[PDB]
Design a protein around this ligand. Structure first.
Ligand SMILES: Nc1ncnc2c1ncn2[C@@H]1O[C@H](COP(=O)(O)OP(=O)(O)OP(=O)(O)O)[C@@H](O)[C@H]1O
Ligand SMILES: Nc1ncnc2c1ncn2[C@@H]1O[C@H](COP(=O)(O)OP(=O)(O)OP(=O)(O)O)[C@@H](O)[C@H]1O
Ligand SMILES: [Mg+2]
Ligand SMILES: [Mg+2]
Ligand SMILES: [Mg+2]
Ligand SMILES: [Mg+2]
Lengths: 317, 317
């Protein structure tokens, strides 16, 4: 009955009209978005959807006035795609689109604002600091200890991220992340199992436990390595996995996520869950996680992209 | 010295290039935005700026690919203009623009989200309820009492608003506001002096006290009536006006306002201030308030629009 609700308006691919798959862009995750778009476009075409691709670049507005578009599938990654900017352009152009609206996308792209919202609601997210100075690195070390994990506030795909074990590599990781974003945050390192929880049309999909011999789930482990471990069902018991899913729903509703999304959650040695971030246009590569979660629920890749598309027939927030 | 910082990059009008004044649109405040744009455009032209106007409509993307534009002056009012959507379109198009960024504009357009952020920071804003039912109207009445003020969450210019003194007109005002927005909120009526506080380039301008023989500061009193009262300096003492200005700065920084903006604040019988809302593209008509506040600080209309333009030469958030 739940899977019936997920496939609600997926029966007629022709009913969606001409669908523009938006991918590429000029963000650091461009290469990831190129493969996600190729997956989504090929999937929509095999399903019988009148779908075409658009490599988002300096060409975009020219293509929006030339091409007829009944609906846009946003599968861009990072700034210029997941930060509400592309969402606002499509609303001005009067084109309906997939995923979260302008406010939710802009908020979820900002890891600092996202964590700040979660804290005001009493949701767990690792203690952190904002780094714009070598003195800031020293204060964060004195208050939070080691190890730490440094990340730009607005990036994805573990780009510009580093786990640091001392002040020496903390300062080097801050300078590296600052080449991607003047907004640099550092979090307390959570030591324990890593989970990721996909949500689709207000339903929380099966959780996936992630493992890699790397120091963390970095760009290489996500997209290039062969020894990354994916486990579904996750080793959690029914009470613990239910707790994780209810935490994911609250964390996504806190930001206003719509259509679909993915939450990345850590668990510590005492069983506590810690929210890291939420993605509003998760990767759709053949290495990606939301497709794995969809299969566990029973949807193949074509049903998944059709479900994301059918959800957009209503209104964003 | 403060006024020097306000006029920082206003000396060379030719230095801004070709400036597109964006006005009109399809929101309920279209007629207001048409007059604000006419004021801003005429002001920029008399200052020696290579400025042209664009009536935002179904024409927009076609005009953005035809016209050369070095900088956009956003003077649209309401949804499609102040809600981050136009801001996101201009960022995708690579055009710098005036005012708050995508996240701040989208947040400040939403009165519910704005009040919700203020509450988490301990800033004062009237107790409220969300109305989507006649039972909701009854619960709000039982909890908040009378009188009340009903408003759509995303409107401006007092459109769809009504002060209600009983359950009969509460329910009628809810149905009327729901024709503009499925998001309807009702606030506790604050009885006392009304102030409005303009901010420009991180500086808080002199406060203006507002008075009208109407039941409240409605669309008619704002734009059509002759007996609306504007008082600058406001009757507050130095300690009280300083308190109001520091509250305005905190309320604007809470949402991420940039460039300029205006806050509307009520004061009750016991001297307490209550934040109503923040506008990220305030009206610029000859009835409008930000020009009055600028004159009190020493800037005429041309210096004001040049200052808004010079601030945009940096980066939005
Ligand atoms: N506080 C933390 N404690 C432990 N590991 C962490 C922490 N924050 C991040 N990580 C690790 O770094 C990885 C990337 O972190 P995060 O998901 O916040 O970054 P992202 O680049 O935005 O990711 P994505 O590819 O999902 O867009 C996580 O999958 C996790 O392995
Ligand atoms: N809680 C309240 N108590 C008393 N008066 C109120 C209250 N809320 C609103 N008002 C009155 O209604 C007017 C319009 O309210 P508000 O500024 O929230 O609406 P708006 O339509 O978004 O305004 P604007 O023209 O500034 O965009 C205020 O100027 C004030 O006179
Ligand atoms: Mg991410
Ligand atoms: Mg992640
Ligand atoms: Mg307003
Ligand atoms: Mg107002």
């Amino acid at each position: 009955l739940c899977l019936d609700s997920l496939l609600n308006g997926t029966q007629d691919p022709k009913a969606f009209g001409r669908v523009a798959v938006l991918f590429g862009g000029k963000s650091a995750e461009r290469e990831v978005s190129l493969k996600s778009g190729a997956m989504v476009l090929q999937s929509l075409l095999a399903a019988g959807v009148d779908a075409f691709g658009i490599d988002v670049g300096e060409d975009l507005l020219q293509r929006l006035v030339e091409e007829k578009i009944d609906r846009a599938f946003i599968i861009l990654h990072g700034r210029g795609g997941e930060d509400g900017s592309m969402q606002g352009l499509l609303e001005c152009a009067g084109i309906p689109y997939t995923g979260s609206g302008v406010l939710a996308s802009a908020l979820a792209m900002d890891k600092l604002r996202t964590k700040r919202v979660w804290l005001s609601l009493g949701l767990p997210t690792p203690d952190y600091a904002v780094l714009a100075s070598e003195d800031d690195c020293r204060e964060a070390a004195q208050r939070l200890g080691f190890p730490l994990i440094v990340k730009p506030a607005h990036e994805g795909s573990s780009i510009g991220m580093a786990k640091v074990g001392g002040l020496d590599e903390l300062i080097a990781a801050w300078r590296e992340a600052a080449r991607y974003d003047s907004q640099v945050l550092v979090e307390q390192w959570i030591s324990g199992p890593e989970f990721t929880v996909a949500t689709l049309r207000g339903q929380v999909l099966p959780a996936i436990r992630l493992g890699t011999p790397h120091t963390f789930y970095d760009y290489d482990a996500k997209y290039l390595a062969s020894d990354t471990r994916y486990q579904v069902p996750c080793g959690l018991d029914e009470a613990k996995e239910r707790e994780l899913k209810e935490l994911t729903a609250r964390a996504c509703d806190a930001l206003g996520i719509q259509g679909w999304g993915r939450a990345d959650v850590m668990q510590d040695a005492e069983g506590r869950f810690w929210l890291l971030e939420v993605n509003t246009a998760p990767g759709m590569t053949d290495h990606s996680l939301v497709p794995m979660a969809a299969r566990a629920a029973g949807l193949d890749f074509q049903q998944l992209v059709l479900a994301i598309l059918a959800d957009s027939r209503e209104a964003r927030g």
